[PDB]
Amino acid sequence: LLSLPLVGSLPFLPRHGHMHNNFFKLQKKYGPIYSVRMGTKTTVIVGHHQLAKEVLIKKGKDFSGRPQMATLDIASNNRKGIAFADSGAHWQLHRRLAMATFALFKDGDQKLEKIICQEISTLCDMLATHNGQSIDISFPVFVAVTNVISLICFNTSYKNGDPELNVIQNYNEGIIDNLSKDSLVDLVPWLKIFPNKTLEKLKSHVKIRNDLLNKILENYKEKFRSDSITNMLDTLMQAKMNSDNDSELLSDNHILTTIGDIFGAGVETTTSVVKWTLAFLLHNPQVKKKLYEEIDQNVGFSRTPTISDRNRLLLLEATIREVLRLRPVAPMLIPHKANVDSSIGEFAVDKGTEVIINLWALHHNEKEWHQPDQFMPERFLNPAGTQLISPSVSYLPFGAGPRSCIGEILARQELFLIMAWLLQRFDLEVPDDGQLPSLEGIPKVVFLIDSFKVKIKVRQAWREAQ
Numbered sequence: 065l066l067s068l069p070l071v072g073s074l075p076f077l078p079r080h081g082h083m084h085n086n087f088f089k090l091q092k093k094y095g096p097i098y099s100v101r102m103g104t105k106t107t108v109i110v111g112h113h114q115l116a117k118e119v120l121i122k123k124g125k126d127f128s129g130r131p132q133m134a135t136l137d138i139a140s141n142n143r144k145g146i147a148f149a150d151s152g153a154h155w156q157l158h159r160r161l162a163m164a165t166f167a168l169f170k171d172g173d174q175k176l177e178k179i180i181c182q183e184i185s186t187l188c189d190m191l192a193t194h195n196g197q198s199i200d201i202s203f204p205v206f207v208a209v210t211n212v213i214s215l216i217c218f219n220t221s222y223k224n225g226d227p228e229l230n231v232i233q234n235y236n237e238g239i240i241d242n243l244s245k246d247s248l249v250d251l252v253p254w255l256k257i258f259p260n261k262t263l264e265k266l267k268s269h270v271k272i273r274n275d276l277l278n279k280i281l282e283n284y285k286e287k288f289r290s291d292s293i294t295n296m297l298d299t300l301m302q303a304k305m306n307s308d309n310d311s312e313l314l315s316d317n318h319i320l321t322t323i324g325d326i327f328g329a330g331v332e333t334t335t336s337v338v339k340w341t342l343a344f345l346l347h348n349p350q351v352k353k354k355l356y357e358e359i360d361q362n363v364g365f366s367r368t369p370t371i372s373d374r375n376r377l378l379l380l381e382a383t384i385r386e387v388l389r390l391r392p393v394a395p396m397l398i399p400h401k402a403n404v405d406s407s408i409g410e411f412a413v414d415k416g417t418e419v420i421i422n423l424w425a426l427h428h429n430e431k432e433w434h435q436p437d438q439f440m441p442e443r444f445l446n447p448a449g450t451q452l453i454s455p456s457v458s459y460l461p462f463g464a465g466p467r468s469c470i471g472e473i474l475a476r477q478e479l480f481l482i483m484a485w486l487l488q489r490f491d492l493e494v495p496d497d498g499q500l501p502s503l504e505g506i507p508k509v510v511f512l513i514d515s516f517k518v519k520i521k522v523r524q525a526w527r528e529a530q
């Protein structure tokens with residue numbers, strides 16, 4: 065009695081559990097590196113920090129490519145921009161100009177700290193009007209970080225009530241929802257097997273965004289001046305101007321898509337982490353209580369928190385590190401691709417192979433972390449609690465190497481200042497219905513959290529002062 069002819073085999077059920085965890089569970093059986101074949105395409109999944117650092121750092125240039133996806137093609141206007149552009153001249157030029165722009169907010173009066181605090185001050189006055197009510201703080205935080213990035217990109221911002229903010233929120237939501245069903249990593253190409261309108265829907269959302277950025281870029285052409293380089297669009301037009309004396313790599317479509325990536329990444333990524341951090345503080349009142357004490361003893365109510373306070377609010381800094389470990393923004397980074405024949409752990413990897421770094425596995429490795437599934441900001445502090453520490457080398461929240469995060473300085477300062485200002489001024493508690501946020505998460509292009517509500521109250525201590 066023979067065995068059945070076998071035309072296909074997958075190690076776990078598709079659409080059953082979170083992809084990054086399914087891969088991690090497989091390492092028990094198959095090791096920290098294995099492959100899956102899907103037609104002509106082979107994908108390698110790497111789940112150990114030493115192999116990850118080889119792909120990202122040591123052989124970074126070998127695996128600095130991106131795989132081309134029909135979905136990502138539409139969002140990136142055919143692989144323009146930064147995040148979804150393949151390695152090469154385009155990507156390297158626009159990545160440098162983006163990083164170069166964040167230099168113009170180092171110091172001065174538009175010091176990045178000052179643009180951020182300006183928008184947090186509006187956020188906090190906004191939220192204070194909801195004293196005693198339970199609310200979803202998604203949109204208020206979205207507005208604040210949208211204005212930070214609009215100032216970095218255009219030196220402009222939106223006033224309260226501007227309907228355009230809602231238009232952006234709408235198509236941000238629609239693109240993320242249709243960009244991928246779950247993670248960017250899909251084992252089966254359902255998009256090409258059964259009839260569906262995913263690409264149609266994604267196209268219409270991308271049309272609205274492209275139309276909106278065009279209007280901004282068009283009306284700004286007449287305001288641009290060579291001697292005034294104060295934001296990202298200036299940096300890009302200066303390069304286009306000093307090029308027509310590589311100008312094909314600076315067409316209007318190239319400038320638009322790159323600013324779209326910064327606009328998108330700068331908003332959806334920071335809003336999500338704030339929401340996650342809040343959710344964890346609701347499940348961990350003990351940690352929340354010690355944070356209030358920490359900020360009352362090191363900043364008080366004489367002033368508002370500053371970036372310099374990052375040397376004094378250590379537990380707050382440790383909390384942000386722990387959220388970025390436990391619920392990484394990108395559990396599997398963005399997929400990589402081998403530009404040439406190379407190797408990982410001395411295993412052959414052919415050119416064109418898609419390579420995926422399971423950051424979730426790195427952050428939950430039980431040999432590298434103590435009780436990895438527990439929210440313990442303590443793990444990033446010495447036993448005394450007097451200085452931050454790096455307990456593990458298997459920790460890469462922002463990736464590393466050629467394709468690493470370029471908005472890391474912005475994210476860290478936004479996250480620290482938002483939480484510092486909120487904790488100084490507000491009690492943040494379970495809403496009166498008693499529901500706690502679900503910490504399971506929703507894997508999309510970003511690791512999102514289910515929407516939830518918080519009862520916001522102006523702290524008595526903050527009130528008694530002033």
Ligand code: HEM
Nearest residue numbers: 146147329330333393394397398461462463467469471475
């Ligand atoms: C908590 C916040 C953030 C985290 C944890 C984070 C993390 C990451 C990770 C893991 C990657 C992929 C690394 C790889 O593919 O190897 C990435 C890429 C990227 N991030 Fe973020 N990021 C954050 C915030 C931001 C912000 C605020 C911006 C922009 C304003 C930004 C812009 C980008 C871009 C453009 C890329 C693509 C880089 C490239 O492909 O060359 N990120 N980030």
Ligand SMILES: CNC(=O)c1ccc2cc([C@]3(O)CCn4cncc43)ccc2c1
Nearest residue numbers: 147235236239273324325328329332333
């Ligand atoms: C209407 N357009 C959008 O909503 C939009 C566009 C591009 C995005 C890119 C990113 C990244 O670059 C890709 C993942 N990730 C982690 N950190 C930075 C990034 C994240 C969200 C985006 C949203």
